[PDB]
Design a protein around this motif. Structure first.
Motif, PDB file in Angstrom:
ATOM      1  N   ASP A   1       0.811  -1.370  -0.233  1.00  0.00           N
ATOM      2  CA  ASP A   1      -0.254  -0.094  -0.057  1.00  0.00           C
ATOM      3  C   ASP A   1       0.822   1.355  -0.045  1.00  0.00           C
ATOM      4  OD1 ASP A   1       0.872  -0.037   2.498  1.00  0.00           O
ATOM      5  OD2 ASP A   1      -1.309   0.098   3.359  1.00  0.00           O
ATOM      6  N   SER A   2       0.216   2.440   0.166  1.00  0.00           N
ATOM      7  CA  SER A   2       0.791   3.823   0.079  1.00  0.00           C
ATOM      8  C   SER A   2       0.109   4.723   1.118  1.00  0.00           C
ATOM      9  CB  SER A   2       0.893   4.189  -1.185  1.00  0.00           C
ATOM     10  OG  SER A   2      -0.512   4.343  -1.719  1.00  0.00           O
ATOM     11  N   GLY A   3       0.794   5.740   1.308  1.00  0.00           N
ATOM     12  CA  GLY A   3       0.204   6.903   1.990  1.00  0.00           C
ATOM     13  C   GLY A   3       1.423   7.703   2.759  1.00  0.00           C
ATOM     14  N   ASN A   4       0.946   7.546   4.384  1.00  0.00           N
ATOM     15  CA  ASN A   4       1.944   8.206   5.207  1.00  0.00           C
ATOM     16  C   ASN A   4       1.668   7.608   6.708  1.00  0.00           C
ATOM     17  OD1 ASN A   4       0.184  10.351   7.238  1.00  0.00           O
ATOM     18  ND2 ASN A   4      -0.268  10.758   5.121  1.00  0.00           N
ATOM     19  N   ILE A   5       2.607   7.831   7.314  1.00  0.00           N
ATOM     20  CA  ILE A   5       2.410   7.620   8.963  1.00  0.00           C
ATOM     21  C   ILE A   5       2.513   8.553   9.971  1.00  0.00           C
ATOM     22  CG2 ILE A   5       3.232   4.997   8.487  1.00  0.00           C
ATOM     23  CD1 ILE A   5       5.946   5.674   9.810  1.00  0.00           C
ATOM     24  N   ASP A   6       1.936   9.847   9.636  1.00  0.00           N
ATOM     25  CA  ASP A   6       1.911  10.872  10.272  1.00  0.00           C
ATOM     26  C   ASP A   6       1.327  10.624  11.983  1.00  0.00           C
ATOM     27  OD1 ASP A   6       2.915  12.233   8.139  1.00  0.00           O
ATOM     28  OD2 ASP A   6       1.354  13.367   7.799  1.00  0.00           O
ATOM     29  N   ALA A   7       0.258   9.729  11.604  1.00  0.00           N
ATOM     30  CA  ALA A   7      -0.323   9.320  12.916  1.00  0.00           C
ATOM     31  C   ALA A   7       0.432   8.599  13.903  1.00  0.00           C
ATOM     32  CB  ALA A   7      -1.654   8.594  12.630  1.00  0.00           C
ATOM     33  N   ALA A   8       1.648   8.145  13.497  1.00  0.00           N
ATOM     34  CA  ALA A   8       2.695   7.272  14.410  1.00  0.00           C
ATOM     35  C   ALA A   8       3.817   8.031  14.715  1.00  0.00           C
ATOM     36  CB  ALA A   8       2.786   6.069  13.641  1.00  0.00           C
ATOM     37  N   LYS A   9       3.853   9.190  14.586  1.00  0.00           N
ATOM     38  CA  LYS A   9       4.970  10.200  14.808  1.00  0.00           C
ATOM     39  C   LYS A   9       5.572  10.279  16.318  1.00  0.00           C
ATOM     40  N   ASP A  10       4.666   9.951  17.226  1.00  0.00           N
ATOM     41  CA  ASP A  10       4.981  10.134  18.737  1.00  0.00           C
ATOM     42  C   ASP A  10       5.419   8.573  19.101  1.00  0.00           C
ATOM     43  OD1 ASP A  10       4.136  12.422  20.453  1.00  0.00           O
ATOM     44  OD2 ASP A  10       3.891  10.596  21.952  1.00  0.00           O
ATOM     45  N   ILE A  11       5.777   7.584  18.358  1.00  0.00           N
ATOM     46  CA  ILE A  11       5.992   6.376  18.626  1.00  0.00           C
ATOM     47  C   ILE A  11       7.457   6.015  18.221  1.00  0.00           C
ATOM     48  CG2 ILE A  11       5.477   3.592  18.262  1.00  0.00           C
ATOM     49  CD1 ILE A  11       2.488   4.818  17.423  1.00  0.00           C
ATOM     50  N   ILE A  12       8.119   5.403  19.068  1.00  0.00           N
ATOM     51  CA  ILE A  12       9.495   5.099  18.544  1.00  0.00           C
ATOM     52  C   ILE A  12       9.412   3.699  17.873  1.00  0.00           C
ATOM     53  CG2 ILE A  12      12.039   4.382  19.254  1.00  0.00           C
ATOM     54  CD1 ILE A  12      11.050   5.705  21.970  1.00  0.00           C
ATOM     55  N   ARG A  13       9.728   3.667  16.477  1.00  0.00           N
ATOM     56  CA  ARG A  13       9.539   2.755  15.541  1.00  0.00           C
ATOM     57  C   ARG A  13      10.781   2.018  15.006  1.00  0.00           C
ATOM     58  NH1 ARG A  13       8.523   6.918  12.200  1.00  0.00           N
ATOM     59  NH2 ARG A  13       8.304   8.143  14.180  1.00  0.00           N
ATOM     60  N   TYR A  14      10.644   0.735  15.192  1.00  0.00           N
ATOM     61  CA  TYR A  14      11.855  -0.218  14.811  1.00  0.00           C
ATOM     62  C   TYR A  14      11.377  -1.054  13.533  1.00  0.00           C
ATOM     63  CZ  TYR A  14      14.716   0.896  19.279  1.00  0.00           C
ATOM     64  OH  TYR A  14      15.335   1.530  20.073  1.00  0.00           O
ATOM     65  N   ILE A  15      12.238  -1.396  12.722  1.00  0.00           N
ATOM     66  CA  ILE A  15      11.669  -2.565  11.733  1.00  0.00           C
ATOM     67  C   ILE A  15      12.842  -3.323  11.346  1.00  0.00           C
ATOM     68  CG2 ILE A  15      12.360  -0.850   9.740  1.00  0.00           C
ATOM     69  CD1 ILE A  15       9.862  -1.952   8.181  1.00  0.00           C
ATOM     70  N   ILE A  16      12.360  -4.687  11.446  1.00  0.00           N
ATOM     71  CA  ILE A  16      13.385  -5.770  11.148  1.00  0.00           C
ATOM     72  C   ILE A  16      12.572  -6.363   9.764  1.00  0.00           C
ATOM     73  CG2 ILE A  16      14.155  -8.109  11.787  1.00  0.00           C
ATOM     74  CD1 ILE A  16      13.175  -7.331  14.708  1.00  0.00           C
ATOM     75  N   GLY A  17      13.678  -6.342   8.795  1.00  0.00           N
ATOM     76  CA  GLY A  17      13.273  -6.753   7.665  1.00  0.00           C
ATOM     77  C   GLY A  17      14.075  -8.168   7.188  1.00  0.00           C
ATOM     78  N   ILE A  18      13.402  -9.335   7.023  1.00  0.00           N
ATOM     79  CA  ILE A  18      13.784 -10.497   6.870  1.00  0.00           C
ATOM     80  C   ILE A  18      13.859 -11.238   5.526  1.00  0.00           C
ATOM     81  CG2 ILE A  18      14.068 -12.862   8.122  1.00  0.00           C
ATOM     82  CD1 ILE A  18      12.276 -11.534  10.315  1.00  0.00           C
ATOM     83  N   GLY A  19      14.799 -11.921   4.951  1.00  0.00           N
ATOM     84  CA  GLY A  19      14.938 -12.709   3.863  1.00  0.00           C
ATOM     85  C   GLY A  19      15.664 -12.268   2.489  1.00  0.00           C
ATOM     86  N   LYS A  20      15.173 -13.061   1.599  1.00  0.00           N
ATOM     87  CA  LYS A  20      15.537 -12.906   0.151  1.00  0.00           C
ATOM     88  C   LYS A  20      15.178 -11.508  -0.526  1.00  0.00           C
ATOM     89  CE  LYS A  20      16.087 -17.658  -0.409  1.00  0.00           C
ATOM     90  NZ  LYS A  20      17.116 -17.991   0.550  1.00  0.00           N
TER      91      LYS A  20
END
Ligand SMILES: Nc1cccc(Sc2ccc(/C=C/C(=O)N3CCOCC3)c(C(F)(F)F)c2C(F)(F)F)c1
Length: 182
Positions: free
Chosen positions: A117-136
């Motif tokens: 999908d697409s858009g923005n994450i303006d609503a999540a600005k007050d959250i400390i966000r980590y992201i784990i991407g996994i695999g090929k």
């Protein structure tokens, strides 16, 4: 001082049953280690749609990761990451689900592919966000870079890419070396 932490985990069609399971087991390993602390947890599966599998109140009442995740059904659809993160911000971080209003908010996104999908994450600005991407799916620098817009800055701190699902074992080992009484 209080940390409310959401695991937002990929349930897309690309995940093999054992890969999905390794995600589940990673989440449980983390929660078990941080039992009886200022952390309280909730877990949201995302694919095409979003499902709060358990909330903070569920965690507080039972304190049993194995039980809390026992009934997860792998969605096997797309990877709507923008919508998922927005769903967490607006529908998960709420009193009604046991969130503490003044707690530090943390999101741990676990994914094996680029957003559908697409858009923005303006609503999540007050959250400390980590992201784990996994695999090929994350072999190229370009594919890793697409994950950057989802996580807090800098990427060097908030983005992790893993070659395989077995490396979640290794990430958990490393994680524990960052645990301190402050
Ligand atoms: N370098 C990097 C990049 C992407 C993912 C990761 S994994 C990770 C990372 C952080 C945490 C916990 C953070 C936390 O509770 N904090 C730090 C921010 O301020 C509040 C306390 C955690 C948690 F365990 F505590 F929940 C993880 C975790 F969960 F292992 F995936 C690491």
């Amino acid at each position: 001082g209080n940390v409310d932490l959401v695991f937002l985990f990929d349930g897309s069609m690309s995940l093999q049953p054992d890969e999905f399971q390794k995600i589940l087991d990673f989440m449980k390993d983390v929660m078990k280690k941080l039992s009886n602390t200022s952390y309280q947890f909730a877990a949201v599966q995302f694919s095409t749609s979003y499902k709060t599998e358990f909330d903070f109140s569920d965690y507080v009442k039972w304190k049993d990761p194995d039980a809390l995740l026992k009934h997860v059904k792998h969605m096997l659809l797309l990877t709507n990451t923008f919508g998922a993160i927005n769903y967490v911000a607006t529908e998960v971080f709420r009193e009604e689900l046991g969130a503490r209003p003044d707690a530090t908010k943390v999101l741990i996104i676990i994914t094996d592919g680029e957003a559908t999908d697409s858009g923005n994450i303006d609503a999540a600005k007050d959250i400390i966000r980590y992201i784990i991407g996994i695999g090929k799916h994350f072999q190229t620098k370009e594919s890793q870079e697409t994950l950057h817009k989802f996580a807090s800055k800098p990427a060097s701190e908030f983005v992790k890419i893993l070659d395989t699902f077995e490396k979640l074992k290794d990430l958990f080992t490393e994680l524990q070396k960052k645990i301190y009484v402050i």
